[PDB]
Amino acid sequence: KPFLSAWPSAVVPRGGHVTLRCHYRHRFNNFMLYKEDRIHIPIFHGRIFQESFNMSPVTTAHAGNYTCRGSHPHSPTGWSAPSNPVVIMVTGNHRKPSLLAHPGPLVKSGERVILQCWSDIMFEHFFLHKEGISKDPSRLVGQIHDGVSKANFSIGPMMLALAGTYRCYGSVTHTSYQLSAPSDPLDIVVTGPYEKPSLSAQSVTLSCSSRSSYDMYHLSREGGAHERRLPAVRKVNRTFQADFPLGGTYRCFGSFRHSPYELSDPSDPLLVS
Amino acid sequence: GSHSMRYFYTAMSRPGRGEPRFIAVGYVDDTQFVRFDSDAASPRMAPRAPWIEQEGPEYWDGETRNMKASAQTYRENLRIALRYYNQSEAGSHIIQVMYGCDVGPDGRLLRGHDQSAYDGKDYIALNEDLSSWTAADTAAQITQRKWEAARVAEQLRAYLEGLCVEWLRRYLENGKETLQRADPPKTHVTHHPISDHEATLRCWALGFYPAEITLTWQRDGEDQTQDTELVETRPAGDRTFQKWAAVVVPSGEEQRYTCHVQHEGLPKPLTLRWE
Amino acid sequence: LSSPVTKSF
Amino acid sequence: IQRTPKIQVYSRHPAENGKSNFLNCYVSGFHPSDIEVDLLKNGERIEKVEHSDLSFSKDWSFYLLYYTEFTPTEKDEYACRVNHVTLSQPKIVKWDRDM
Numbered sequence: 001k002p003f004l005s006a007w008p009s010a011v012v013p014r015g016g017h018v019t020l021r022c023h024y025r026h027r028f029n030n031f032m033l034y035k036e037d038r039i040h041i042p043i044f045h046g047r048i049f050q051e052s053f054n055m056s057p058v059t060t061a062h063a064g065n066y067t068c069r070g071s072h073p074h075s076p077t078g079w080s081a082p083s084n085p086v087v088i089m090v091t092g093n094h095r096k097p098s099l100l101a102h103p104g105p106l107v108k109s110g111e112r113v114i115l116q117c118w119s120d121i122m123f124e125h126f127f128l129h130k131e132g133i134s135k136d137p138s139r140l141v142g143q144i145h146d147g148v149s150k151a152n153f154s155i156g157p158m159m160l161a162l163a164g165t166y167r168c169y170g171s172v173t174h175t176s177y178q179l180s181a182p183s184d185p186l187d188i189v190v191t192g193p194y195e196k197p198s199l200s201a202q203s204v205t206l207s208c209s210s211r212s213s214y215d216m217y218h219l220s221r222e223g224g225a226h227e228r229r230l231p232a233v234r235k236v237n238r239t240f241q242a243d244f245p246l247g248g249t250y251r252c253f254g255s256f257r258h259s260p261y262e263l264s265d266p267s268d269p270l271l272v273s
Numbered sequence: 274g275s276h277s278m279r280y281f282y283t284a285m286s287r288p289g290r291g292e293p294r295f296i297a298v299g300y301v302d303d304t305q306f307v308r309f310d311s312d313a314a315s316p317r318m319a320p321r322a323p324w325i326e327q328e329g330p331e332y333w334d335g336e337t338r339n340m341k342a343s344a345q346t347y348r349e350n351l352r353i354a355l356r357y358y359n360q361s362e363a364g365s366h367i368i369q370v371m372y373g374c375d376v377g378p379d380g381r382l383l384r385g386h387d388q389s390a391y392d393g394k395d396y397i398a399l400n401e402d403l404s405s406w407t408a409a410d411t412a413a414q415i416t417q418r419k420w421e422a423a424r425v426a427e428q429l430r431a432y433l434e435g436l437c438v439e440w441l442r443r444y445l446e447n448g449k450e451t452l453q454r455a456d457p458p459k460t461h462v463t464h465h466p467i468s469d470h471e472a473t474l475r476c477w478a479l480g481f482y483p484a485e486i487t488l489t490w491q492r493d494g495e496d497q498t499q500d501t502e503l504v505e506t507r508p509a510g511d512r513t514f515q516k517w518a519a520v521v522v523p524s525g526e527e528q529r530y531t532c533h534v535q536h537e538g539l540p541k542p543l544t545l546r547w548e
Numbered sequence: 549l550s551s552p553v554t555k556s557f
Numbered sequence: 558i559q560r561t562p563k564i565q566v567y568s569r570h571p572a573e574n575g576k577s578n579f580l581n582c583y584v585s586g587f588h589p590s591d592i593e594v595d596l597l598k599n600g601e602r603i604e605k606v607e608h609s610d611l612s613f614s615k616d617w618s619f620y621l622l623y624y625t626e627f628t629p630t631e632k633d634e635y636a637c638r639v640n641h642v643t644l645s646q647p648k649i650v651k652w653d654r655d656m
């Protein structure tokens with residue numbers, strides 16, 4: 001049985017590029033492709049692909065459920081068993097849906113979050129897909145209500161492996177492998193179990209510090225717009241501290257280098273008058 | 274005692290050739306007793322020794338769930354290692370982990386281990402005090418900072434002191450007849466002429482457990498440890514081991530040489546000669 | 549018994 | 558960095574002609590883990606060949622045992638064929654009763 005794969009992603013926008021590789025008998029050998037509509041008719045009239053099948057630029061015609069067979073001369077058929085199925089979904093065909101987090105995008109380790117995808121357009125199916133090379137989407141049937149169609153994806157228990165940038169898509173009937181434009185991205189971030197920094201007051205300046213060697217600190221106003229970054233500086237007292245120069249309620253997070261979707265547990269809320 | 278329990282994790286990416294694979298194996302001393310492979314129909318912790326087969330469903334359920342969690346974590350860890358070393362996403366890489374406990378005769382904790390490597394080279398490892406880490410490079414220093422902030426060492430110490438030791442005791446009890454009684458090597462010496470002026474004396478040890486053994490050659494009571502040939506101890510296939518040690522001798526000096534065999538399955542050390 | 553301790557890099 | 562595999566071909570029990578036995582190919586000290594191992598009867602691959610689960614030693618190098626039921630004879634030559642990324646062609650190590 002060959003191993004079929006799509007690179008970099010099976011979910012691919014129109015005008016993008018995706019390569020199908022069929023690995024069989026320690027080689028990316030000559031192989032034939034097949035769709036799911038009727039499994040034993042080789043596409044492009046029995047075309048035997050030499051190396052790998054680069055679809056570029058991707059059109060809506062490339063969308064579908066693929067399976068490959070590798071060449072195996074010293075065998076009764078001369079060809080291998082059907083490989084693992086790989087579904088190529090093409091996006092950018094409809095208006096984008098909306099993606100929302102409940103209660104929010106910041107999810108503490110071990111807990112769950114609801115990612116709701118909804119639209120005015122009556123999408124038959126919804127697909128949740130996390131940004132990343134070699135990632136498969138989840139599917140839910142759209143529930144119709146009050147003029148909008150929606151679906152709730154459950155994600156948990158929260159671990160770093162589940163953190164990242166999420167987008168949802170919609171598909172209308174008769175075009176299941178054709179997906180809408182992606183919804184606006186939603187960054188799902190895990191908080192903890194790393195120890196919370198302390199946040200205190202040193203015009204005022206809010207200093208958040210920790211004994212742990214966080215690479216940088218994030219300050220956020222509860223009900224604010226954007227978060228404020230500041231690199232942690234190794235102080236003389238061996239503490240790592242960031243000083244945010246400045247009413248409301250603030251919180252401080254610690255984070256490490258090369259780890260974009262994880263933060264420490266949030267600091268205690270700081271009331272500034 | 275003394276006895277050991279070890280777990281070995283192998284996590285490997287193989288872009289284009291398969292999805293990331295996680296393999297775990299469990300050992301008591303030299304005997305494998307459990308395994309887990311993420312590349313199956315439905316991945317489950319499975320028995321690999323008869324004396325663990327009668328543990329209840331709760332054991333296997335718990336272990337399977339833990340192994341699933343571990344598999345996910347180490348797939349993600351591969352993805353992380355890629356960012357740490359700024360490597361291509363088309364390459365094949367491997368993380369290896371080994372951890373466990375050494376207990377003594379009465380069955381109390383003597384030492385704890387938890388070491389991990391990336392691509393065959395040391396990455397990061399728990400220190401003897403079981404509260405601190407040793408990193409091999411900058412990426413591993415990042416990992417160290419993370420694990421210190423998350424206090425992983427305290428949890429690991431709690432596991433090694435608690436569950437590892439107790440379950441090791443239970444295992445040692447479960448298969449005592451096979452795990453705690455050593456089997457002495459059946460041994461002999463063979464002669465193989467090289468030329469008319471020299472020949473090879475080979476000392477054989479077969480069917481012994483555990484794997485630890487010493488085979489030495491002596492000329493007139495002195496170890497010829499430099500000009501001796503040793504093979505790796507090899508498994509026979511039935512949870513017992515084989516080993517031999519050879520030496521090249523001048524023709525007519527066979528009497529001068531003796532083979533010495535020490536193994537815990539023997540009451541007294543063994544001495545052998547060819548005739 | 550294997551370790552229940554999560555080792556995230 | 559890569560390590561080439563060491564190979565030992567040997568029987569489980571002292572081999573006597575006509576007596577049922579087990580043939581072992583023990584491969585070790587290699588890195589990475591991807592490796593191909595075949596047991597050969599007069600140059601041809603044996604059908605039923607089982608193997609141990611992937612493990613490694615303290616130097617992080619892997620080891621594997623491949624084994625098969627066989628009957629010792631002097632007419633039939635048994636061997637082990639091992640291919641690894643460090644090997645251009647697969648190595649044939651023949652079974653020798655005194656090794």
Ligand SMILES: *[C@@H]1O[C@H](CO)[C@@H](O)[C@H](O)[C@H]1NC(C)=O
Binds near residue numbers: 085
């Ligand atoms: C892809 O094809 C296989 C077999 O043809 C089928 O089992 C599978 O359900 C298909 N996948 C999807 C998303 O339809």
Ligand SMILES: *[C@@H]1O[C@H](CO)[C@@H](O)[C@H](O)[C@H]1NC(C)=O
Binds near residue numbers: 102114116152
């Ligand atoms: C979807 O998730 C959120 C919070 O649970 C909320 O909008 C709503 O209760 C959910 N919709 C359901 C359960 O149909």
Ligand SMILES: *[C@@H]1O[C@H](CO)[C@@H](O)[C@H](O)[C@H]1NC(C)=O
Binds near residue numbers: 209235237239241
């Ligand atoms: C460390 O030094 C800074 C002054 O640079 C100070 O604000 C902070 O309170 C000190 N941290 C501790 C724990 O003393």
